[PDB]
Amino acid sequence: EVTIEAVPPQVAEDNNVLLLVHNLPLALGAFAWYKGNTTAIDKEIARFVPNSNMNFTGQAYSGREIIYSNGSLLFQMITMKDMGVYTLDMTDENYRRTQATVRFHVHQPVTQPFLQVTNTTVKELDSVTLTCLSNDIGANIQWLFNSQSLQLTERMTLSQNNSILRIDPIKREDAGEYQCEISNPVSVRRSNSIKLDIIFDPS
Numbered sequence: 179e180v181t182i183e184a185v186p187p188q189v190a191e192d193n194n195v196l197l198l199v200h201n202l203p204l205a206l207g208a209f210a211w212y213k214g215n216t217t218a219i220d221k222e223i224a225r226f227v228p229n230s231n232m233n234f235t236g237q238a239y240s241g242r243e244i245i246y247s248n249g250s251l252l253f254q255m256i257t258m259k260d261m262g263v264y265t266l267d268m269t270d271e272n273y274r275r276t277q278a279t280v281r282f283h284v285h286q287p288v289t290q291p292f293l294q295v296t297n298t299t300v301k302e303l304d305s306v307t308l309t310c311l312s313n314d315i316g317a318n319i320q321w322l323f324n325s326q327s328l329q330l331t332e333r334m335t336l337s338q339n340n341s342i343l344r345i346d347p348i349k350r351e352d353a354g355e356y357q358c359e360i361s362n363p364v365s366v367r368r369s370n371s372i373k374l375d376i377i378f379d380p381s
């Protein structure tokens with residue numbers, strides 16, 4: 179049947195996207211590409227017609243959009259505002275089918291963070307608290323230890339959406355360099371490399 183995929187699904191700001199239309203049934207009278215599920219002329223961006231090949235547009239922006247004979251739509255410079263679901267409708271008088279559910283996501287390229295730790299020098303069974311400073315909201319922070327995934331365990335505690343990380347009680351094992359990392363869908367940027375070394379109080 180009708181399959182509509184968006185390449186790339188998960189788009190990036192000031193980057194392009196295509197509204198793929200797989201197996202688009204028998205050569206209809208024409209197709210229509212709408213925004214937002216509203217099967218209303220209120221939002222018609224494009225209507226291509228088989229039987230007499232021709233491009234007529236609707237009351238839709240068309241500042242950067244294109245419909246195709248395979249019945250598909252590329253979308254240039256998408257923006258947070260362009261985010262959301264889109265719908266295509268097709269018709270051949272005998273029948274008009276809508277079934278064009280297709281949503282994708284836009285993304286703000288990430289920025290570099292920066293840890294802040296108070297006292298690289300700490301005692302066994304004391305506290306530490308890496309905090310991954312970032313100004314970007316819509317986060318996926320990840321904590322790295324010695325350039326690999328911090329296993330995250332019982333004596334650790336982290337909140338404010340993975341921002342603040344607090345290890346306690348600390349133990350020599352923690353003798354290493356910690357780094358915080360921000361994700362978006364894979365448009366990432368790692369933090370500095372606060373090294374933390376340990377001294378223990380008793381002997």
Ligand SMILES: *[C@@H]1O[C@H](CO)[C@@H](O[C@@H]2O[C@H](CO)[C@@H](O[C@@H]3O[C@H](CO)[C@@H](O)[C@H](O)[C@@H]3O)[C@H](O)[C@H]2NC(C)=O)[C@H](O)[C@H]1NC(C)=O
Pocket residue numbers: 196198199200201246248249250252
């Ligand atoms: C519907 O018609 C459009 C015609 O443009 C088809 O979209 C186009 O599909 C190809 C897919 O490969 C895109 O080219 C790709 O380009 C990248 C970079 O050049 C390359 O790495 C890939 O190997 C590939 O060649 C093309 O950009 C894309 N969109 C546009 C706007 O041209 C679509 O495939 C057609 N539907 C079907 C079912 O074929």
Ligand SMILES: *[C@@H]1O[C@H](CO)[C@@H](O)[C@H](O)[C@H]1NC(C)=O
Pocket residue numbers: 223224233235240243244245
């Ligand atoms: C309709 O076809 C023209 C060329 O005839 C093309 O340049 C234009 O982008 C198409 N309209 C849309 C909304 O894609």
Ligand SMILES: *[C@@H]1O[C@H](CO)[C@@H](O)[C@H](O)[C@H]1NC(C)=O
Pocket residue numbers: 297299
């Ligand atoms: C780190 O903590 C120890 C506690 O023994 C203290 O002596 C030292 O002054 C602290 N360093 C800073 C920069 O606060």
Ligand SMILES: *[C@H]1O[C@H](CO)[C@@H](O)[C@H](O)[C@H]1NC(C)=O
Pocket residue numbers: 215263279
């Ligand atoms: C959009 O409105 C329709 C009503 O026809 C509703 O059934 C549908 O759940 C809404 N959006 C999606 C993605 O289904």
